[PDB]
Structures are given as C-alpha cells and as structure tokens.
Amino acid sequence: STGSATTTPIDSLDDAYITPVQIGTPAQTLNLDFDTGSSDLWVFSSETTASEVDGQTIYTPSKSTTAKLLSGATWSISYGDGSSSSGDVYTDTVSVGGLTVTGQAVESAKKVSSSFTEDSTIDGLLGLAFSTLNTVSPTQQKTFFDNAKASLDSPVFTADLGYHAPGTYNFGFIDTTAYTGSITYTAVSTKQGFWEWTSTGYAVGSGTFKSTSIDGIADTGTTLLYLPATVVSAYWAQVSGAKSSSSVGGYVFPCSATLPSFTFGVGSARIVIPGDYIDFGPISTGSSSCFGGIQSSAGIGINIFGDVALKAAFVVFNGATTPTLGFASK
Template sequence: MLEHVLLLTIWAISACGAPSPSGLGGRFHIDQVHNRNARRNGPVEYAFAHAKYHAPIPKGLSKTMAAIKKVNINAGNATGEVPSWPQELDIEYLSPIMVGEPAQMVWMNLDTGSSDTWMYASTTGEGHKGDQKFYAPEVSKTSTHVPNTSWWIEYGDGTYASGDVWKDTLSIGDVEIKNMTIQTALMASVAMVTDVNMSGLAGLCPNHPSTVMPSQPTLLEKLEPVLDEFVFAADLRYQDTGRFRFGHVPKSDYEGEIHWARMNKTSKFWQFDINSVHVGGTNILLQSTWSFIADTGTTLMLLPMDLTKMYYDQVPGAEYNEWYDSYTFPCNETKNLPSWDFQIAGLNGTVPGHYIAYTNVTEKLCYGGIQPWSAETYGFGILGDVFLKAVYAVFDVQNKTVGFANKKVRA
C-alpha cells in the first residue's frame, strides 16, 4: 500500500506507554505521539499520493523511485483514550485497537481517504506479512467467517492487498463495535510487508464504498449507532501530540468558531471548496474557487499548478526540479519560507512556512511540503497532514459537512 513503507526503515517504538482508557460513553479520542527517530522522504510521499489516487506518476519521479527501490533492494539484506504512534516522523499515525474476544491488539492507520478496514491475520500467507501484530480470528470467541465474500485493494504503483472477510467485535478504548466487517489479508505486496509496525488500515471515508464484494458495512456505518454525535475530528500536530476525537467536539479543542463547508454532493471523499489563497509576506492574492479533499492518509499539500507556482515564486532559489518532478528550494531559505494563507467558508487560516519545509533531498537542497497536482484532471487537490496540522478539522458525517477552526500552532 504505502510506497514510503517500502523505502524507509520503520523502527518499533518501545519508549511509549500503554493506552489508558477513560471518558464517557459514545465518545472517545485517540492520541498521537511523535516518533522523533523516524525519517522523511518527500519524493516517496509524492509518489505514494499519485499511486493512492491512481494518478500516473510523472516521468522524472518514476525514474527516481525506480532508482531508490533498486538501492533499497540491494541494501535490504465511545469511551476511552488510546495513544497513537506516528511513523516516519510526521508521516504515518498508528492507533492500537482491540479485536475479538479475548481482545487482540492491532496497530491501525486511520485514513480519511479510504473506506476499507483491513488487517494482517494468522491466515495471511507466508512471505505476505512480516513481524506486525496480527489478528487471529480462529482464537476469537466472537469471530464469524463471511463465506463467498472477498476484497482486493490495488494502488496505482502496483502495490496491493487482498483476502477474505470476517465479522468480529472491534474495540476502541471502551467503545465496542459488534459484528464489525474485518477484511483479513491473505496476500499483500512487499511494500506493505516491510512496514514492521502497521497491522492494517481503518478507513474513514464517507461516501466511498469499501472494496468488499458483496458489499458490507464500513467502519463509519458501524460507528453511527455507537457515537453520541455522528462526527469525528482530526487535531493533528506539528512534531507534537495530536488527536482524533469521535462522537463529540468540545470547544476547548479549538479557538473561535468552527466554519462549515458543504461537501461536494457528487464526491466520494471529504471534498470542499477553498475561496481564496494568499502567500504570506506579499500582496499576491488569488480569489477563485478551488476544490480540495481532506486526507489524513496523505502527507503533502497537493495543489493546482497555479497555486503551487504562486507559492514558490516567493521563495528565492526555488525551482521545479525535473529529477523529482517536484519543487525544491535552497535549505538556507527554510527559516524564511512564507506562510500559505487561505479562506474556507469564512475562516481565515494559515499554514506556517516552517510546516512547508518538508525535508532535505541533498545537503543543500530541500523538498517542499507543497507540490503540484493535476486538479483539473482529478477534480480536486489534496490537503494532507502538512495542512491538517495547522487547523482543527471536523468531519460531520450526519450533515455532510467539513468544518475548520483555528487552534494554537507550534511556532
């Protein structure tokens, strides 16, 4: 699944403590804890986003990815709170979730850009899983196999996972979801297997059906009768503890008011419009309507070319690098990067410049957290974690709206 999983070594996080349940029925939150030992790889994240949305990977980036793969192959020898450990620095967030009776803990990636809930299992074939914690349905007293049902996920870069389907109890903190659809992997590509921490993925996409055939209820559909309010929020943080909250959105989590944007009626994703964009420190302002999706499973901000170019035109020495098919800039400009200011449904918000300084690609060359995307072709741009760390994002499933509020951000 995740292209960056193939290329970057993921280390188990042993310093973090166990989750401590607390809270009220029908609402819970999942904390996120920053992994300071992990690494970033901008081109890998950019390629993964293309693969996830079945977009052709640009020629230069494709060659770069092939070279990186070759190097790695040759070197390859309701109620409760649960901590979540991000992998690869700020890139991937894992949450411990319990499955079955007696409870088995698995580490899941919460993804608002997907609807599948799948995990490695005892039935996963040899060579198709690594040392991840996995689900063993045969030892659960509450598991039931769903006959004549299967699933298959394939990404644009050729990575895949597939398998069969079970029903079992899924527990997050003290919240129990009975007869949850559990997609167990019988096969998975090498790119997934090399992620030594991730047990699977929990999809939170609203209108996109899962890949299970015949169709089965998704995680959001099963959460609806359990939650006090059919809503969840993502409070991601820059190099700091963040949080997913389900069932309730307290005012203490954010500043001011939540501004609500109506979801695109025909979209399968959390899609909404941005009304204006301004690059900090300049008088350049574009007023138009751009459509975006909020995706916790994508790292970068992927913008239409006009917005991307407008930003990097304000960064001395920044250029479009044909080797990566991406924008890079001199690392000595990192502390001077302008902010990316926006307006959504009347909310004026800011992504600080240092959030956009994503990572080094060489000693002197840095990779930007804003990159171009063919929004005209795909109908939307993608606002991933670089953007979401700067806002409080609320996903209202019941009312089909996405809300944004300001919050204190890390300087």
C-alpha cells in the same frame, strides 16, 4: 457513546499517523492508519503472505472468539500512491478509544504491496471516507464510523493531528477545548465517496489572499498538500532555489531555506499552515535538497488536503444526513 484515541506520527516527518485499535476478543491491539480518503478497514493478519510481513503486528482471527468469516467476501484496493492490498473478510468487535462496534468488517490481508511491507509501524488502515467506496465484494461493507454513527452522541468524528507530536481522533463529540476561535463549516459533496469540499482560496506567506475555488478532499491518509499547479508554482516561487524536479518527483528546495506559511480559505475563515509544516527534509540521507510539503495535483485528478493542511487545523467530519466539514484554528 463516544470514543477518543491518541494518534501518533510514525516518524520524524509526520509521513503518517497511527492510532491504536482493539480488534477481537480478547483484544488484539493494532496500530492503524486512520484514512478519511478510503473506506476499508484492513489489517495485516495471520493470513498475510509471510514474506510480505516485516515487523507489523498481525490480527489472528482464529484467536478471537468473536471473529466470524464473512463467507465469500473478498476485498482488493489500490491507493493513489500506487500501493495495494487484498484478502478476505471477517466480522469482529472493533473498539477505538473506548468506542465499540460489533460486527465490523475486518478485512484480512492475504497480499500487501511492498510499500506496506516496508512500513513496519503501520499494521493496517481504518477507512473513514464514505462507505460507498468500500471495496468488499460481493457485499459492500460499512466503515467503522458508519457502523458507530447511530450510537454516537453526535454523528461526527474529529481529526486533530499534531505537528511532530501526538494528536487525537474523537468520535461522537466536539472537544471545545481543542481549538481556538470558532469552527467554520463548509459544504461536502459525497458524489465521489470522499469528504470533498471547496476551499475559498489561498495566500502565500504574508501575501494577499487570492479568492478562488479549490475543490479538494480532506484526506488524513495522504501526507502532503496537493493543489493546482498554478497555486503550487505561486508558493514555491517565494522560496529561493526551489524547483520542480522530475527526477525527484516534485518540488524540492534548499534545506537552508526558511519556508513561508501557506493559508487556505474555509468560507470566510483562514487556516494558516506554518512554513515548517511544509518541510519534509532531505530527499535522501545527507542531501541539502529538501522535499516540499506542497505539491502539484496535476495528473492526480483531484486536489488533496492531506496531513500538511489538516494538521494545522481542528477538523470536524460531520456525518449528519447532510454531511459537512468544519475547520478551526488551534
């Protein structure tokens, strides 16, 4: 089997991407944030505190003839940005782009933090990291991809995020028309439950490539590119007027600037992030100070190859017995 679904930026900045997901019988379609940095599939629901729902589409398990309460199961998750959600668990039929899993754990939110309430475009998350991170207790649950894996033509999914435009998540196959050149594969450590790999270095604009190992995670659920302070300093030093602002919470730059590209290494291959991808617009409406798409990972504890990086590539998440990551230009 295979699946193929279009993923769409939620706003003009590509702050996140939503992908339609069919849940239950008859289908209830929710737009979920596919997140290779977490491993819970959770949804706004009929159980969600009513004051914490503001525009989202909800899953109503009582209207699904295939929904079954997973007795005693609860979940609770906190994300790197400080947002959180929690609730109980159903199993139900979940389909993504024609690909169907029966008995998928669908985690029903009873509570969500303000950040989720305030984002009316995101109806929940579909986690695609390793199932070892799944927060369901007392019986940990498998991700959609883990459940689908055996049925897939090939145990892979691919992320093809668009810059200010729709893209694609494919399951079970590699679309050889979706990228240019070759796919370069690189080793993954699952030790922290993430798609964790080591970039071989970086370049700023037309500058020379610096060979240096950068351990990080491929995370579709993080908007920006978070790298070591040395790297990030080297990047923003090439932008006149750029500075790290503690009041804003990161590097800002004059909106009048033309940003240089940023290249990261995948083995011997190179992925080029165009400068425009690194512009996240005015810090506040009408401001001439713009927020940078490359930020320091210092104090995060891990480097994150978020959407800013991933959207510059065709990315293969290879879930073979020994997982790997593949990157191609496109």
